[PDB]
Ligand binder design. Structure first.
Ligand code: K
Ligand code: K
Lengths: 314, 309
C-alpha cells in the first residue's frame, strides 16, 4: 500500500553545457549534452522513496522513448508505476536547459503530456489516492487536475501537501481551503501575495496572508536559511533554521525538501511540524552537497539514524 | 547497389521548443510545443538526394544511445546505406537544442558530440565506396581533418567534390577551397568567409570571386528567395539564377535541400548545364520551404514535376 501518492509531473531534462548563455538570435556551441530526469512531482516522489516511503507516481508521459525511459527511472527508484499513464496525443514533458560553467541557466519547459493527465485518469487512480496517507501535488500539470486530486484526497481524509509551483497569481481559492500543508519558496510567495519575500521576517508576513485564505499549515522555504511555518492552531511564525553546509549544486533542493516532508507526514504523523521541518531542512541540505537533481537526493542508509526516530529529538 | 552519392558529414538530433518569448539568463519560461526531428547538414543533404532517387551512402558517427539508434533507423527508412554509419559510447549523438518564438526568432545550442569522433580510420574503411561514387559531399559540422581526408580521397579517385562551408568560420584551411570542385554557401556564410557585405546579387558576385581566387573551381552563393549566383574558373562572370516567388511556410532546411538536389544532379545528370542544374535545385529547395519541418519537408521524385527529371 502506497503511503505517499504524488499526483504531478515528469519531465525529461535535455541539458547542454556551454561557456556562456546565448541571447536572442544567437547560435552557439556547447561542449556536452546529456539527458536527466526531472519534473517537480517525480523529483519529490524520488526523495520520498529514497527515504523509505512506499510511493506511487500518478502522472502522464508520452507513448514515446522519453516516456518509456521515465517509467524505467521510476522503477529504478522503487516507485510504483501502476498509475504512470502514456498518451499518443502529446510528447513527454521536457525541460530544455542551457547551463554555463558557473551554473547559470536558461530553461524552457514544455509541459506536454503532463497537461493531459485528466479526470478519467484520476478516477482510475481514485482507489490509490483514497488509501494513501499523503497526497502531494504541484502546478506542473493542469491546475484543474491538481484541484481534483486535492478534492479527492480531502473527501477521503487524506492529508494534502500542496506545492504551488510554479506559482500563478490568481489561484482558485479552493487550492488554499483544500490544502492541509501549503509549501512554497520565496519567489512563489511573492507571486501569491504581492509582497517582498527575502528574509524570515518577510516570509512570516507572507505566510499569514496565505494562512487566512484557508490553509491549515503554511511553510515558506528560505534557501540556505531554512524555512518559516505557521498553522491555524499555531499562527505565530516559527523560523526553523538549517545548519550551514558547503553547497555544490542547489538544483532540486526544494523538491528534496518537499519529498522529505511528505515522507514525515506519512510515516511519522505524530511528530510536530517543527520536528518534521528540521529533518526535512537537513535532508535538502544534503542534496545541495552533490551534483545534479535526482542524482543528488540521499538514501535512508546514507543518512543519520536520528532522522528516523519515532519521537521528538533535541 | 553502388552508391553514386557519398556524404561524409553530420547527423544531429533537433530538439525544438516553441515558445511565445525567448528566455533571458536565469529565467525559466514555459513553451507550448516540443518536437524531435532528424537533422544535421550531412544527413539532410543525403536525405534530399535519396528522395530524388539517388543511391546514397552516409558516412557519419552517432552515439550508442537512443537518439543514435533512432537516427540509423531514419537513414534506413530513407533508403540510405548505413554501412559506414558508426556508433560510439564516447559521446552522445550530436544535438541541436533550438528555442523558437512565434515570430521565428531563435536561440540555438549545438553540441556536435559523436559527429566529431568520426575519424580518418573510419573513413579509410569506406575507401572502396568513395572510389566508386560520382559525388562526395562534405560540410563543416564534423572534425576538419576528417572532411579534408574525405575530399582528398575523392580527388584521388576522380570523384567530384561538393563542399558546403557551413557553418562558416573566418579562417578556413586553404585546402577546403583547393579540394572543392563545387563550393556552395549562403550569403551569411560568404560574409564570414570573405569579410565582404553581401546584400545583393551583385555583392554576392564579388564575394564569389574571392572564393574562386582561393582555388575553387565553381562557386555558388545562394540568396534565399532570390535564387543563387554562380561563377567558375571557365566562366568567372557572375550569373544570377532567379527563382519564382513562393509562399514560405518554413524555410528551415532549405539550404540542405538545395545542396542535396545539386548532388543528385551532379551525379545523375552530369550533361546538364550548371545553370540548368541550379534552376532545378532552386525549384526543389523552394518546394521544401512550403512545408513545415526540415527533413519532413523534402520532396520525393514522385511528388515533383516530370520536367525536373
Ligand atoms: K543537488
Ligand atoms: K521546410
Amino acid at each position: 500500500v502506497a503511503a505517499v501518492v504524488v499526483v504531478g509531473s515528469c519531465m525529461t531534462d535535455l541539458v547542454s553545457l556551454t561557456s556562456r548563455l546565448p541571447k536572442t538570435g544567437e547560435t552557439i556551441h556547447g561542449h556536452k549534452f546529456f539527458i536527466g530526469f526531472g519534473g517537480k512531482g517525480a523529483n519529490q516522489c524520488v526523495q520520498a522513496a529514497r527515504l523509505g516511503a512506499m510511493t506511487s507516481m500518478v502522472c502522464k508521459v508520452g507513448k514515446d522513448s522519453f516516456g518509456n525511459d521515465y517509467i524505467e527511472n521510476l522503477k529504478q527508484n522503487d516507485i510504483s508505476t501502476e498509475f504512470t499513464y502514456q498518451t499518443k496525443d502529446a510528447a513527454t514533458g521536457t525541460a530544455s536547459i542551457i547551463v554555463n560553467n558557473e551554473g547559470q541557466n536558461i530553461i524552457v519547459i514544455v509541459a506536454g503530456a503532463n497537461l493531459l493527465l485528466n479526470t478519467e485518469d484520476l478516477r482510475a487512480a481514485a482507489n490509490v489516492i483514497s488509501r494513501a496517507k499523503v497526497m502531494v501535488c504541484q502546478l506542473e500539470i493542469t491546475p484543474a487536475t491538481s484541484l481534483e486530486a486535492l478534492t479527492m484526497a480531502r473527501r477521503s481524509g487524506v492529508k494534502t501537501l500542496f506545492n504551488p509551483a510554479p506559482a500563478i497569481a490568481d489561484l482558485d481559492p479552493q487550492f488554499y481551503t483544500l490544502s492541509d500543508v501549503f509549501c512554497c519558496n520565496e519567489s512563489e510567495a511573492e507571486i501569491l501575495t504581492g509582497l517582498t519575500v527575502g528574509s524570515a521576517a518577510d516570509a512570516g508576513e507572507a505566510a499569514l496572508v496565505l494562512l487566512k485564505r484557508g490553509c491549515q499549515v503554511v511553510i515558506i522555504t528560505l534557501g540556505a536559511e531554512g524555512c518559516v511555518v505557521l498553522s491555524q492552531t499555531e499562527p505565530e511564525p516559527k523560523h526553523i533554521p538549517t545548519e550551514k553546509v558547503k553547497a555544490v549544486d542547489t538544483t532540486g533542493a526544494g523538491d528534496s525538501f518537499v519529498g522529505a516532508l511528505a515522507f514525515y507526514l506519512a510515516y511519522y504523523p505524530n511528530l510536530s511540524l517543527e520536528d518534521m521541518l528540521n529533518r526535512s531542512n537537513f535532508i535538502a541540505a544534503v542534496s545541495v552537497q552533490a551534483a545534479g537533481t535526482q542524482s543528488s537526493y540521499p538514501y535512508k542508509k546514507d543518512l543519520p539514524l536520528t532522522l528516523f526516530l519515532e519521537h521528538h529529538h533535541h
